[PDB]
Every structure is written in structure tokens, then in C-alpha cells.
Amino acid sequence: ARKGILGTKLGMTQVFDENNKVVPVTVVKAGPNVVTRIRTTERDGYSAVQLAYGEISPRKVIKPVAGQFAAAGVNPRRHVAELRLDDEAAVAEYEVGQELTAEIFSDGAYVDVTGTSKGKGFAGTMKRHGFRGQGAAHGAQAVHRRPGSIGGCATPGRVFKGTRMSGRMGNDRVTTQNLKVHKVDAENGVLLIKGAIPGRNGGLVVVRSAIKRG
Amino acid sequence: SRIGKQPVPVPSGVDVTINGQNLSVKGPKGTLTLDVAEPISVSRAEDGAIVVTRPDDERRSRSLHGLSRTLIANLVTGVTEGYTQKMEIFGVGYRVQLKGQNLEFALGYSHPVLIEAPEGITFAVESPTKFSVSGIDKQKVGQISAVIRRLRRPDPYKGKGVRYEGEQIRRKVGKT
Amino acid sequence: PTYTPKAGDTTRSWYVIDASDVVLGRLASAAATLLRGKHKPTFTPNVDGGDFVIVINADKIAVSGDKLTKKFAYRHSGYPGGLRKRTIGELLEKHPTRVVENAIIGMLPHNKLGRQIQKKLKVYAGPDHPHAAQQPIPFEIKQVAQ
Amino acid sequence: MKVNPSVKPICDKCRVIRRHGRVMVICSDPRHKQRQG
Amino acid sequence: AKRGRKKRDRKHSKANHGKRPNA
Amino acid sequence: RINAAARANDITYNRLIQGLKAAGVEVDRKNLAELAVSDPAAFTALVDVARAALPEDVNAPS
RNA sequence: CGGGGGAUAAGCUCCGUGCGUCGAGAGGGAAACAGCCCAGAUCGCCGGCUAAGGCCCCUAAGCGUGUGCUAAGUGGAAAAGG
RNA sequence: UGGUUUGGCACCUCGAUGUCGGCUCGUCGCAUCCUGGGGCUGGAGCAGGUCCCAAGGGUUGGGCUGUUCGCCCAUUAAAGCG
RNA sequence: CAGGAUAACCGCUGAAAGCAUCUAAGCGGGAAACCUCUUCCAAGACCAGGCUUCUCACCCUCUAGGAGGGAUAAGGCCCCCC
Ligand SMILES: [Mg+2]
Ligand SMILES: [Mg+2]
Ligand SMILES: [Mg+2]
Ligand SMILES: [Mg+2]
Ligand SMILES: [Mg+2]
Ligand SMILES: [Mg+2]
Ligand SMILES: [Mg+2]
Ligand SMILES: [Mg+2]
Ligand SMILES: [Mg+2]
Ligand SMILES: [Mg+2]
Ligand SMILES: [Mg+2]
Ligand SMILES: [Mg+2]
Ligand SMILES: [Mg+2]
Ligand SMILES: [Mg+2]
Ligand SMILES: [Mg+2]
Ligand SMILES: [Mg+2]
Ligand SMILES: [Mg+2]
Ligand SMILES: [Mg+2]
Ligand SMILES: [Mg+2]
Ligand SMILES: [Mg+2]
Ligand SMILES: [Mg+2]
Ligand SMILES: [Mg+2]
Ligand SMILES: [Mg+2]
Ligand SMILES: [Mg+2]
Ligand SMILES: [Mg+2]
Ligand SMILES: [Mg+2]
Ligand SMILES: [Mg+2]
Ligand SMILES: [Mg+2]
Ligand SMILES: [Mg+2]
Ligand SMILES: [Mg+2]
Ligand SMILES: [Mg+2]
Ligand SMILES: [Mg+2]
Ligand SMILES: [Mg+2]
Ligand SMILES: [Mg+2]
Ligand SMILES: [Mg+2]
Ligand SMILES: [Mg+2]
Ligand SMILES: [Mg+2]
Ligand SMILES: [Mg+2]
Ligand SMILES: [Zn+2]
């Protein structure tokens, strides 16, 4: 129904289309993964499949997680996530212990990307929210970049909870939809995605089959 | 009242059964069900007729008596004979044709328009400019007739569209 | 002096009320009075003396008039322009028990005594309940002629 | 759809009916057709 | 306005017999 | 408290007080309350006495 | 209550009334509300009888009794007119 | 009906209620500018006149007067009223 | 995009009231308006949710009613390079 696969962001690079075009792409290493658990309606109340990724030494992991993985019947891994399906026929396809690779996708099929944004740190209003400052000369009094008026006078007499103003930004989940896929390399198990995707070098990223149009 | 007083006749070739308030009728054309309003009771005459009686002469009873009588008459006549309607199309370059259970219209739009045929009804076409629709339930027949009629906007100038058998449309002439 | 309740003289009980073809006002009044324990002769306002109650088959509640579409339950999240509304028909369609829960909550004092009291009520939608192990006693709404 | 607080049978062919609490008159002549509100 | 009509109309409660200070 | 006890014993408070007045027993609300919390049998006896002393029809124009 | 000034407007102003109240007045009644209704505080009592208003629960007392009207949440905002 | 302009009353604030536009930043109503859906025409069609429902989004940049108001210069769907 | 129920409007079957009528019983169509459908937060939601794995055992004291103190496993924290 809706296929999915984990991976990691690597960097940027160019590729030239057969029609002699130019299109920047991103390199994503969708490494092999394993299935550790399956969620069924009568057991949990929904349908989804659990995945795992990453190579870690056995002594790193903690004992409860090690025991869970041993009961599942696979070696330890670093990260774990799940894909939420919509029916029972689809989940019937997946079984515990199965191995998935990047081949599952085909070129020309639009997908979605999920990840975390950058860390920008505390920032001013004009930068975080794109306010417009005021005159930098002709009689300023050190109000070059501060917003200014904030609300009414005695009616109602508050700040109208939800007003847009200064505060920290970034470091949150962000997703983009219907991104074109250019080429797939089997031996290297890497993806070439047109455009730019969120995240940082050596970060975590999960890609899913397109919903809007796919 | 005045219209509900007369018992509904029943022909020999129709079966009638009563189960409390619910009523079902079996005939050559098929069978149908019905639920009756509780304020009014229904009785069957031994002389092959149906009698509907009202307990009191207030407004609701006076209204429902005639409704029940006429509805019973309509359903019995429908199950006995049925209902059919004929349609005709006027204009230039207007056509219609039958494709299985589905029917398509050509009113001159850029793209063709198709109408699906729900259950219990059938469409019959004898000429490219005239067709007919048949069914058992008068309400369904009328609904489908209105839906087919409303395909094209009224045209009081050239009369292009679909018109009933005896239906006459007002026409006004534009000098300019 | 007048009698007062001691540390451990209070005793509770289990009650169940059906809601098949009954009027919401009567059901709410009966539930409120039972919760408060006005019937028990050991009433004292300062300490609760209520009794457990179970309500079953909430979806069959009958309401007179056109209230199915002309009565509206309102609530507001808090941000500006966040006042959105729902109708009783959709409320029953989606959450059967919400209407009765809200009615009983409104039918009781809004102080913290009542806030603690509302813990005393459990309301269900289906004709069954997993609380059969405590042997609830059936109850019926009745009028005392005078 | 002439909307006025008051309506009348402008010509003999106007007939008055009541719908959903609002009374309006229907007639063959559209000019003669109006509703109150 | 709306404010004025309320107090004068609210004076017609049978409790006060219809006569109240300040209309 | 008295109203609760009477309603439990299947008689209204107003009719109970009317019966007490008719029988001419002058005991006070505090006494009734204490007796009810203490002696349900005595409360029932008093209620029966009041019911017996009640007139025929409460709706009569008398 | 009977009047003048006013646009027969003001919670406006100026008069007369063996006229009420507040001002110098607690309680109860109408959600809150000095000028409206009942009612004039010597003090104590874990006692009875009542005015105004109320008796589905909030909140004490009637989901009182008998005869009639209401389809509009009219009940719980107003006029020429239809 | 609205209390939004010009007005009448002096009831709260002279041991202080700091003042017109502009800049930045909102929020709300509909008596609707477009965007949406209908109907009646002295509606060939494009295009017009009028009425009904509808508040999700948008509503430019310049010259002149401090100006509010107002006039003018070039496009877009519009350069909405409070 | 698609689906559900709606305002303005267009309807089918129909007595009161032998006729007629979109209605008082019923059944239908109909929009950036409303509800799901898009992204994010979210069990301090006190009804404090659900599926799993890990340890599930050593003492003392007051007076044996419980509580307090000390010593441990799972884990966590402090310091250190980033
Ligand atoms: Mg930005
Ligand atoms: Mg700047
Ligand atoms: Mg400075
Ligand atoms: Mg500066
Ligand atoms: Mg006129
Ligand atoms: Mg006056
Ligand atoms: Mg006077
Ligand atoms: Mg005068
Ligand atoms: Mg004065
Ligand atoms: Mg004077
Ligand atoms: Mg005095
Ligand atoms: Mg006083
Ligand atoms: Mg008082
Ligand atoms: Mg005195
Ligand atoms: Mg008395
Ligand atoms: Mg009295
Ligand atoms: Mg009480
Ligand atoms: Mg009653
Ligand atoms: Mg009567
Ligand atoms: Mg009202
Ligand atoms: Mg009037
Ligand atoms: Mg008239
Ligand atoms: Mg003054
Ligand atoms: Mg003052
Ligand atoms: Mg002052
Ligand atoms: Mg000063
Ligand atoms: Mg100021
Ligand atoms: Mg100023
Ligand atoms: Mg409007
Ligand atoms: Mg238009
Ligand atoms: Mg027009
Ligand atoms: Mg609008
Ligand atoms: Mg919006
Ligand atoms: Mg100048
Ligand atoms: Mg008719
Ligand atoms: Mg008709
Ligand atoms: Mg919890
Ligand atoms: Mg540790
Ligand atoms: Zn006419």
C-alpha cells in the first residue's frame, strides 16, 4: 500500500539528464533493515510494522533492549521506527525477520521525506518570523529592529494568546512531499533525490511513498 | 376523508398479506413492503377491498387518512401494471443512444454526458429523438424523469432540450 | 447535639439504571439526587454520602421536540476566534456518552466537593458492563403520590 | 425573487401557500412570484 | 442603544411591581 | 433530614406535617430528626399515625 | 401623582403634594444592584406561627389536584402592515 | 434599526486621562471588490441592471497639500465600508 | 483530489380542501461556507492510556501497628573530551 525505508543524509552532487538537463540531487544511503515486530488490530488497535537500522557493538546497548531484540530473533541495531499502514492485507505481506533494501523503489516514483531541521539557536523576531523593521535614520531611538506596538488599550487589555514574537526556532520534525526520484544504485544501495531535503550531514531520515499524488 | 372513504379495489391476480402494521403485496410484477402510520389502522374487506379508518376527526387524522388511501391505491396499481414514461429531444444535432444498462446524452456540449441507471428501472429507446423509461415504483420513475429533465437549462427562445409528452413551454421572441 | 457522621460509619452501594426510552431530564435528576444521597437519612452537606450508579444504553436516550438540530453544545479552546460549535445529532453520532456526562456534570455543584463527586459516576453506551462482579441492584424512577 | 415584508396576489392567477414558516405566493408569471423575508 | 433598552425592559419583572429606581 | 426520611418511608413531608398537626402532636423537628436517625420503628409508627389521621381527600374544597 | 422649559429627549432642569424611601437604615425578596415590595435591630436560647417570593437539581419546600390553549424554544426583546 | 459626523445633559477622573497623522503590529463585524452558487429581465451572444446566500484569502506603486479629506499618473480581480 | 451533512435555490410521491401544491408523513440534487481528508503539538486527558523486556532480594531500630534508618540489583546522576 505505502512502502517505506530508512536511510541517512550524505550530501549534494550533480547529475545530468538524458535530455541534456541539469538537476541538483541529494545522496541518501538507505541501508538494509530488518523487521522486529508487527502490529495487528486485535492485539493493539492499529496496523503498522516496526523497523530497525544501524550497526552497534553488543556491549553498547542496554540489557532490556538487548533482551527485546534477542526475543525478536535479530542482532542489535541503533535506531527503530514504524510505518503506519491502513489495512490488514498490506501488513500480511510483512513478516518478522524479513530484510528490506533500497531496490524496493523504482525510478520515476514520487516519495516523501521526513527528518529534523537544523539548530539555529535563539534568534530575534525579524529573523525568526520575518518581521519588517523600520527606518534606520531620520530620528531613531534604538528601536531599529524591535517590533513595536503589540495590542489594544484597555479593550480587551491583554496580549491575545497566540501572538507571533521572539523565541527559539528550529530543531523539530519537518516533512516535504512529492519529491521526484532520479536514479537508484543497487550495488551501493544509495538514492538520488532531486531537490534538497531537510536534515544535517550524518543525520537520521525516513522516506515514505508519496501520499498526495503517488 | 372524502378521498379515503372509498375502499380500494383488489383484483383477483394479486396476493395481499397483513402482519400488524407492516403490509406486503405479491403480484406478477414483483413484491414490495410498506410501513403504515400508527394513528390510522387498516382493515381488509372480505369482498376484495381495503378499508382505512381514522379514530378521530382532528387535523392529523384527516390529513393522514387520504394519504394512506392514495398511497395504497398507487402501490397496488403499480404492482399490478407498473409505470412508464416517454421522452423526446428537440433541436439540431441532438442524439441519444443505448449502451447496455447505461445511457448517454448528446446535447451539444464539448464532452459527452453519461447517466447511470439505478436498480429497479430500465431504459427503452425506439428512435434517436425519442426514448422511454420503465419501472415499478412511481416515485423512482418521477425522480429519474426529473433528473433527466434537468440536464439542460430552460430555453424559452429555441426550445432546445427535453420535454414531456403534453408539456408546452412559453416562448418569447427577441427582436434583436 | 445533632447527630454527625463518624470516621467509618459511612456505607456505599451499587446501583444500575437503564436508559431505554426515557427522558433526559428525568434521568439526569434521578442520577443527581442519587449521587448526592438525598434519599439516605444520614445526609450532611460537608461530607459526601453518595452512592455508586451505572448507566447503560446511552444511545437510546430520547429527546423531545426539534432539539435534534436546534440545540447546540458550545466550548472554546482559548485562542482568538476559536469558538467552534457542534450539534446534538453529531454529538450522539460520534460520542454517545458525552451528552449524558456533561448533563450530569452540570446538574451538580461546581465546587470541589462536586468535583470529587463526579468520580462516583460511570456511564456506558452498550447494554453490557464489566462491573457485573459487584452485583449492582436495579433501580427504577418512581413518583410518590400525595 | 422579489423580497418584501408584505406580499399580495398581484393578479388573479396568484395563489398563496405556506412553507417552513414562511408564506409566499406562486404564480405562472414570474413577475407575480415573490417571497417575504 | 442596546444598553438602555435592557434596564427599562428588565424593570417589568413581576417581583418589583414594575417600579424601580432610575427607570 | 426529615424530608429524606419521609420520602424513604413513602410519604411526603408536607403531608406528614399536616398529619402531625391534625393529630395534635407538638413534638419538634429536631425530635423527629433524632428519632428517625435513631429509631426507624418509632418513625414508622408516627408516620402510620399521621396517615391514619389524614383527612379523606386533600383536594376537597373544605 | 398635577404642571412649565424641552423635539410631548434624556439617569435634564424648575415647581406643588400633613407623600414614601435613601441620605442618618441591618434583615428577607428581584444574580449581582442605597432611592422598588415586606418588614423597624435592648441582649441570650441547637423552640413554635407568618407577610413579600417560591416549591425538577443546583437551592428549603408540589416532576400538587381539576378543567381549557401552545408547535412557536413563542415561553426567555419593540411598532406601521401582511 | 446604528450610535460612526455636527449636535443637547454635566454623572466617574484639575494632590494630572499627555495630544493629530505617519511607521511597525494585530483583532473583529458584513451594509460584498474579486474570487463562489442562484434567480428575474425593456436577457441574440459577449457584455449589462437588480435581488438572494456566503467573511476562507487578497486588496499596488507614485506626484501635490502636514494634512484627515481631496485631485491626478500607470496595471491588475479588485485598489471594499467600519 | 475525494467523501459526509448543510444555506440560497431546483425537485419526485402526496390529503387536509374530490382539484392543485417540493410537506404537515417520507424520499432527492445543490458552494473557497461546516466535518473528516494535509503538516505539527499532544496521556499533568487526575478515567493520569496501550504492547513489550529487565531485578523481583540483605539487614537493623522503636515495639511488633506500622513506620524510620543502614546495605544492595536494574537504572540514573556527578566529574572528563567534544
Ligand atoms: Mg522565512
Ligand atoms: Mg529594514
Ligand atoms: Mg538612549
Ligand atoms: Mg541606533
Ligand atoms: Mg407595496
Ligand atoms: Mg419616566
Ligand atoms: Mg409627572
Ligand atoms: Mg413633562
Ligand atoms: Mg442637576
Ligand atoms: Mg426640588
Ligand atoms: Mg429612615
Ligand atoms: Mg439597606
Ligand atoms: Mg440584600
Ligand atoms: Mg427592636
Ligand atoms: Mg407554616
Ligand atoms: Mg402570599
Ligand atoms: Mg430540598
Ligand atoms: Mg409539574
Ligand atoms: Mg381543563
Ligand atoms: Mg422571549
Ligand atoms: Mg408587534
Ligand atoms: Mg393587516
Ligand atoms: Mg460632575
Ligand atoms: Mg467622581
Ligand atoms: Mg480625580
Ligand atoms: Mg503630572
Ligand atoms: Mg494615552
Ligand atoms: Mg497624544
Ligand atoms: Mg448579507
Ligand atoms: Mg457573481
Ligand atoms: Mg440585474
Ligand atoms: Mg463576504
Ligand atoms: Mg480559511
Ligand atoms: Mg507639500
Ligand atoms: Mg396541492
Ligand atoms: Mg403540486
Ligand atoms: Mg498515567
Ligand atoms: Mg547506575
Ligand atoms: Zn400572478
Name the residues in A4-33 having a C-beta closer than 7 Å to nucleic acid strand H.
none
Q: Which residues of C touch A158 (CB under 8 A)?
A: none
Instruction: State the structure-solving technique.
Output: cryo-EM
Residue found by looking up cell 520575518 in the block: A130
Give resolution, Å, one decimal: 3.3
C64/C73 Cα distance (integer angstroms): 17
A80/A85 Cα distance (integer angstroms): 17
Judged by a CB distance cut-off of 8 A, whether residue F10 touches chain C is yes
Which nucleotide lies nearest residue A114, CA to C1'? I39
Quote the strand ranges of chain A, DSSP E: 4-16, 22-29, 33-39, 48-53, 79-84, 99-100, 111-116, 119-123, 167-170, 173-179, 181-185, 190-194, 204-209
Residue E23 C-alpha to ligand 11 middle, in angstroms? 22
Closest CB to C144 among F10, F30, F36: F10
- Which chain G positions come under 7 Å from a protein C-beta? 10-11, 29-30, 35-37, 46-48, 53-54, 56-66, 71-73, 77, 80-82
In whole angstroms, G58 C1' to C55 CA is 21
B163/B167 Cα distance (integer angstroms): 6
Q: First vs last Cα of chain F: how many Å apart?
A: 31
Residue B27 C-alpha to ligand 25 middle, in angstroms? 95
What's the number of domains chain C is made of?
A: 1
Question: Is nucleic acid strand H under 7 Å from A160's C-beta?
Answer: yes
Helix (H) or strand (E) holding F41: helix F40-53
Query: Are the C-beta atoms of residues C24 and C91 closer than 8 Å to each other?
Result: no
**Dihedral sign (CA E16, E19, E21, E23):** positive
User: Could you tell me which residues of chain A have a Cβ less than 8 Å from any Cβ in chain C?
Assistant: 160-162
Helix (H) or strand (E) holding C25: helix C24-36
Question: Is nucleic acid strand G under 7 Å from F28's C-beta?
Answer: yes
| Residue in A37, A64, A32 with CA at minimum distance from that of residue A50 | A37
- Residues of chain C immediately before an interruption (C to N > 2.5 Å): none
What is the radius of gyration, based on Cα positions, of chain F? Answer: 11
Quote the strand ranges of chain B, DSSP E: 8-9, 15-19, 22-27, 30-34, 41-45, 49-53, 83-90, 95-99, 102-106, 113-115, 121-127, 130-135, 161-163
Domain coverage including residue C85? 1-146
